[PDB]
């Protein structure tokens, strides 16, 4: 209730280190990944995405950028394999974007910046919630996935035509029956590394695994991305853009690849 941290010249990722240390740590997101250095890992497992029970609950615009959550209190929308051991249950999802096609995402790929980034946010049931998953180094998993702009995502749409009813800070709508699989590319090929939540606290809790195949959303849906607002209803109006935290030191990690 006394975070102040944003997005802003006076609050933003190079001001954070300030209430949250942990932002020049170890194992800080997002990074850069260096394909030519990223090294497949034979030992590396096809992940396992199972979504077909999943249970959307509500859309909320948090400040930062805006939630779509999902019933967790079940094994209803599961990742399974890859680099994990245990099972990790979605939460939410959200993006990142930028005020521009050209930035927006957290990760980069050969320092390329794609216009958004959306983060499938699961935690480790062996933590029994999330609260508790978060101060574990394995904690949570969050499957990254690059967005370009091109052609319609049309499993986007639903997402992108519910944004006028949550344009402000608080706001939140019904939002239930929405199908993540639709945001999905065809391939799961994926990096991995160990990270950091991206925004406040930061805390060091992230398998990454960051699937190599972008997704395809049109300038319009985008567009619309652009419109939401930072700030509550009757505050100044400040567009909800550039809501990404840039690559941080890779320091002692490596990052591994699933294929090639
Ligand atoms: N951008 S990212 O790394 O996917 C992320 C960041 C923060 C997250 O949790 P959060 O919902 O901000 C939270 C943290 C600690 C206590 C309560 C709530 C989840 C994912
Ligand atoms: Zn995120």
Not at 217 to 244: A, T
Request: hydrophobic residues 35%.
């Amino acid at each position: 209730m006394s975070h102040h941290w944003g997005y802003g010249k006076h609050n933003g990722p190079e001001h954070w280190h300030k209430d949250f240390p942990i932002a020049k740590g170890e194992r800080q997101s997002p990074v850069d990944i260096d394909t030519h250095t990223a090294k497949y890992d034979p030992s590396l497992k096809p992940l396992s995405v199972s979504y077909d029970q999943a249970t959307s609950l509500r859309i909320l615009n948090n400040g930062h950028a805006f939630n779509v959550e999902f019933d967790d209190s079940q094994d209803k929308a599961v990742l399974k394999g890859g680099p994990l051991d245990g099972t990790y249950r979605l939460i939410q999802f959200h993006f990142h974007w930028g005020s521009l096609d050209g930035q927006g995402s957290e990760h980069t790929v050969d320092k390329k910046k794609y216009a958004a980034e959306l983060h499938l946010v699961h935690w480790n049931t062996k933590y029994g919630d999330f609260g508790k998953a978060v101060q574990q180094p394995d904690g949570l998993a969050v499957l990254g996935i690059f967005l370009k702009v091109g052609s319609a995502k049309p499993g986007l749409q639903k997402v992108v035509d519910v944004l006028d009813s949550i344009k402000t800070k608080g706001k939140s709508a019904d939002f239930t029956n929405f199908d993540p699989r639709g945001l999905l590319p065809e391939s799961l090929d994926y990096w991995t590394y160990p990270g950091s939540l991206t925004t406040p606290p930061l805390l060091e809790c992230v398998t990454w695994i960051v699937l190599k195949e972008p997704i395809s959303v049109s300038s319009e849906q985008v567009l619309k991305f652009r419109k939401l607002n930072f700030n509550g209803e009757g505050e100044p109006e400040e567009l909800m853009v550039d809501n990404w935290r840039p690559a941080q030191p890779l320091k002692n990690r490596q990052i591994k690849a699933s294929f090639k």
